Design a protein around this nucleic acid. Structure first.
Lengths: 62, 96
RNA sequence: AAGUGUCUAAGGGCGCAUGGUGGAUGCCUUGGCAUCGAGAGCCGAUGAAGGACGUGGGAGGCUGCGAUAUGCCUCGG
RNA sequence: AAUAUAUAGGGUGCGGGAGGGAACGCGGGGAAGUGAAACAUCUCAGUACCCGUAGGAGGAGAAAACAAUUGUGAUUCCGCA
RNA sequence: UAGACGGUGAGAGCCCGGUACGCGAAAACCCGGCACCUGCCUAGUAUCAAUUCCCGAGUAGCAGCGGGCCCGUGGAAUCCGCUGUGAAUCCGCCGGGACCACCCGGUAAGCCUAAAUACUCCUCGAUGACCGAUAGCGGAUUAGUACCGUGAGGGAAUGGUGAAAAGUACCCCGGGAGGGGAGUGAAAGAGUACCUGAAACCGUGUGCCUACAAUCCGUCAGAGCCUCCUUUUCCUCUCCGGAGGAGGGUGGUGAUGGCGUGCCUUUUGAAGAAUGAGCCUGCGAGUCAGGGACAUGUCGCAAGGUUAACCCGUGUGGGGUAGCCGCAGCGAAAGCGAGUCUGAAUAGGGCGACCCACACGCGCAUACGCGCGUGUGAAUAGUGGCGUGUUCUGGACCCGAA
RNA sequence: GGGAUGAGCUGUGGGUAGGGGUGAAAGGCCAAUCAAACUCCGUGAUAGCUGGUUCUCCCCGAAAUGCAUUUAGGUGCAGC
RNA sequence: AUGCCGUGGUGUAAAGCGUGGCAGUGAGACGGCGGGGGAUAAGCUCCGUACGUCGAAAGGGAAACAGCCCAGAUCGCCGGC
RNA sequence: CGCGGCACAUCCACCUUGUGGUGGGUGUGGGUAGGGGAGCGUCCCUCAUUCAGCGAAGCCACCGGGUGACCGGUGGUGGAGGGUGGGGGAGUGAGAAUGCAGGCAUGAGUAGCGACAAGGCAAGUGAGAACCUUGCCCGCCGAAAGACCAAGGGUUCCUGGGCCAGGCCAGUCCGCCCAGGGUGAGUCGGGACCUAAGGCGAGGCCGACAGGCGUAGUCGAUGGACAACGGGUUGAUAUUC
RNA sequence: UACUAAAAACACAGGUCCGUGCGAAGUCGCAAGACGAUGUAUACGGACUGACGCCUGCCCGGUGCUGGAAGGUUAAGAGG
RNA sequence: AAAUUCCUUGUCGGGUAAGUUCCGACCUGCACGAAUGGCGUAACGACUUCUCAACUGUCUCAACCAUAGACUCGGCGAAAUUGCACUACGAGUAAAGAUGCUCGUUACGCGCGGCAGGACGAAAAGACCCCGGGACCUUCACUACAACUUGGUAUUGAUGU
RNA sequence: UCUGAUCGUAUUGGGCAUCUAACCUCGAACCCUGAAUCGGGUUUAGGGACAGUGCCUGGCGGGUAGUUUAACUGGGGCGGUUGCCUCCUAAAAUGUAACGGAGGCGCCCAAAGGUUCCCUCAACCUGGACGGCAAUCAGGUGGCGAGUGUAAAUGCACAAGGGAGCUUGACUGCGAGACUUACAAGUCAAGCAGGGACGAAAGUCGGGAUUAGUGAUCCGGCACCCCCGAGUGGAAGGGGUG
């Protein structure tokens, strides 16, 4: 009767001004001693969703 | 998925929050003013919504996008600095 | 003497003709499902809903009826 | 009366009730299956079911309410958000 | 102002019952006008001071264990119930999301309150791009009957003669049933077992094959008989016919030879000694609601487009801008804004801007194209409706567990 | 074949009813079924498994491989 | 030796890549060539190969025969190689 | 390869020189799950048109037709709703679910025909008799295959009448069907008298409510109380008349 | 153990152990109220064993029951 | 050496002719044992187990007779089952075991009575195994609850110490 | 005025005792019952502020209730294993499984890191008192057998080994561009800016010679940055970075 949006998807993915979806990488909240600042630079940012699963995600958010 | 931790749980929660008190303003492109009102004359909320270039029942800001030549005062709120520069370069005036 | 050599249906098979059983398809409905609009939206210790029993000129059921018993009285069409 | 008032009880008389009613409503009670690819938290659900108790509709109601300075001024119901 | 349906011997405006339309109420009853009846009121308004008193008591609030509120005890508001403690009467109290202060709104702990709204067992009227007797409710027929079960409960199947009964008088077989001859009827190919009367199935008659031969039971070659049929020697009996025969050609049978391991499901793999099907008939499984969502084809408009609810109106037409998507995005947010963010700066980098076959003026360049204004017409769009395919939630392709 | 004056058999009328009853106990008996009876309701329940899915034509044309799984008889992404 | 990455010519209706929509497969078997487990084994089993075929491919031949050999059926022909 | 006919992509030339088609050439065309595209048929609605009791639909046979899902025509039966075309809308196409409902087959005129008590004969009824009837023999139980009550059944008793169906066959007869008749109580067994086990159980206690237990009182027999015995009769009833 | 098993199973008498001082314990019931019992420690309830005869040995460390409460630990509440 | 013993028919001896069983004895008790009771016990038992006299068709070794069936005749008239049919065999092939396939051999069509080797024969969606799902059950498994139980507060006081 | 002790005094509770007054009494008597052993009441006798009952809280708790109790697996079970790293099997790019072969890791280091500078061991032979072929010393041979923090490989003599001085880059803000891969995730990164250690300089350094030494998500905690702050100002709480 009326759609629902997967909440966790809405709380993890952000649609941009155009047809793209980004992921906040944050494998950096538990343990950070052995991880160098280099690896944290690699993880830091909001990368684009891989095209091997955008076709699923867009229906998860819509 | 079928056998492994879903991508939802696997990924981190997107950081940040949403404010309840986010008084969002609508947008009036000064270039659109240029082509819409090349004659100048009079500008205001009522005229812009009469043209249908902007939503009703909300305050509007002005962009620095576009070459403005029409010398006309603009009745609106929260102009950007570039908007004032373009407006007074043409020779008009901002309100508030 | 040697050789060639048709035929038979106790009963089956195939195909036609002519018939039976059965009651499917076709058209139909004295019967139904779902709906819009308008009433009524209660009955009952004054003995209700619902029932047995019993009643008809002649077996029995339904219907209507209650020892005044497929009916009585009164005003109406 | 029991004991003294006196009362419980008893007696007389006058009103009402119980039970039915397909659905709808209110107040109160209250599961599992299922989903979660297991499963208790959660859901399914305050559903199914039950009890009380009405009505023609009921319930709710006339601000110790909203908003946060444009201010509105009982309730209910539909559609947006 | 009657063409709504229907009935009447085959399809009816004018044959009928009816409809349109217009009449019609003793008695009862709902609403409604009037009278009686009933009932409130011998004014508290204006002004001022605030010393006095009141303004809902085992209540609120607080602490504790819970419900429910987007809100699962979390920092947990307000509301509700339970247990102990237990306030005030306007310089008061409650609330405004722990909480304090200021500000603001309002005065709980008594009661009653129509409208908009929900439902139709049941009673008239009406419709239906709903079935038409294995469907529709199970119930068109003795229906919640018969029947099963101690019982709660479960829960069947059976419609059609013909317009009319005109129901085959009479006669003949026969114990009768049943049949036959007559006869009614348009028709008996309409006889209570009754419109049409399918298929499996049983059976009679008849053309062909078959008792020395092994194969999913056929196909292809293919002899010779039999049915039918054209041309023709010919029967000349010929103004008749195709008798017969040759030859030719449809439709059967098919001697005899070659060839060939049944369907489906599921399986690496099947004809199966792997499963399911006795045969026929009927029924039976991917559909629907939602201005759902992504993509698509096509059709309206055109920086727009679109209405929902609700109103008016009669065939589903016109209104109705509240709202949604698009229109500028980035950023956790403030806030900034064609940039913005991180960041000391940002040189860099993340999201998004603007891609020229190119002229005018012009920096750059031998030529090749970069750029600011105007332009050789330079690059352009969503939205709404109807289908398609998918998908979410709805029993969701269907049947079946314990 | 055993008991057959006894812990007896039998009729009549009565009580115990479901996670409960009863039981000289066997996990049997409770309307032919009992390691929790029957009918109905929630119910069109569920099932990573089996089974069935109805007419045709034309073009093109797979895999049984990897990664992960409270997973190896399923599913997801990738490959074709 | 093969095999693989990359470049420059040549040849081939065309395959490929990226981008969206809708599915299946996610148990594989055998044979040829190289390998491990096993005994120098098995119609055994786990891998590899831009090796095929069957699977999803009818036909010929191997007596019959899914997997080997040849050979990839549009349909018809009482025509040839 | 040859000789011919269809089809999809592509090349070429034309019609709008790809709307979509027309003419020619090359290559292509095995195919499951599965993707894509175009199609066949049935029922209903709308519009237009149109045949039809001078015989529609459905059904049967026959002759032909299309590349396919299929069609047209002719003839017969029967007797009232269907064809052509553009559109809309589907409970839409059955070959299997140890599927369901109905009907009919093979097995098959086979097995079975219901205690190890036993029937036989004559005459007669009758269209018809081993099975009913009347006679006469034989045989069997006889602490049960006899005669009576309750419980239960609820007209199955009798008379008359029928023999489509039922009876494990026939079957004039029957506990099958139809019509009609038949059950007589002061004393037999019950209520009019109480009562046990036990149930209801106002009042009352407890319990959120529904409700549960239980006193009084009242019900509840197989028990206790209470007056009858014999004989005869009708087709049937009997301690009843 | 109807409907495959009647026994070397069950059960009783007897023998031990534990509990209860009476609207008792236990059980059925939420409570009321019943049973137990119109009885009460030579009675009643529960468990093991199973006439009779001979006998019934050692260990309290673990796990349970019962008694104590030095000491430790120990929630709410009071207090804060 | 047993209801208790796998190695085991443990070893010795009677019983038999011959005894993996039985009876008696040693103990080298894989594993006896004291109230989950040890060791004996007359009588008893539709119990289990061994031996013996007598008799017997249980066998040696079968045979005859009768009866209700089977068979025929007449009548009524089912069923499970059922992919089709004009349903041979051998050696082979094959999803490994072939009526249906290849090559061979053999048989007149049909039909009645018997046998029961086959048609993975029929009846039953394997009653053993495995996997998935569910029921039930036990417990030093986990988490909750009823019940019994401890403390405080209220119902709930006074006087004293 | 660490105020032991302590006069009594405000408070408070506990404990104890006594008392009767709520309350209990299937303990007696009488009565509405002449129809009652239930019930209710009056009076009396006795228990007693206990107990019981409601709230809150701790504890015992298979008597009862709902579920779990893994998978692979040469059927199952028992047994053994499960992540990461290194070699082989592996068929000469990579990749490549088995209950197929062999071994480690769930650590270590403020020096074993970084920088500048310097060196080349082992084994062997000769000689040599304590002292032996087996510590140490010289000479000669010896271009790598030693060594590599740690299993193994691969590489290291130009040395990554060894020795020494000064030091903390065992940094901050970024990082074009690639490999690998289904995805998440991993790996490398010249080079830029700040600031600084080393070094005469040129230059190196964003940990260990490289490959293992670890673990996503949610929730929660610590420090810091006013980022927001439910009327407002604050606060709580939330947000951001490590």
């Amino acid at each position: 009767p009326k759609a629902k949006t997967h909440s966790g998807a809405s709380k993890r993915f952000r649609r941009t001004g155009t047809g793209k979806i980004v992921r906040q990488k944050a494998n950096r909240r538990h343990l950070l001693e052995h991880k160098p600042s280099t690896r944290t630079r690699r993880l830091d940012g909001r990368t684009v969703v891989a095209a091997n699963d955008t076709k699923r995600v867009t229906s998860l958010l819509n | 998925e079928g056998g492994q931790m879903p991508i939802h749980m696997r990924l981190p929660k997107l950081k940040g929050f949403r404010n309840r008190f986010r008084t969002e303003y609508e947008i009036v492109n000064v270039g659109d003013i240029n082509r819409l009102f090349p004659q100048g004359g009079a500008v205001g909320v009522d005229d812009l919504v009469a043209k249908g270039a902007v939503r009703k029942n909300a305050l509007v800001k002005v962009l620095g996008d576009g070459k403005l030549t029409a010398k006309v005062d603009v009745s609106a709120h929260k102009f950007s600095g570039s908007a004032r520069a373009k407006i007074t370069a043409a020779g008009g005036s901002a309100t508030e």
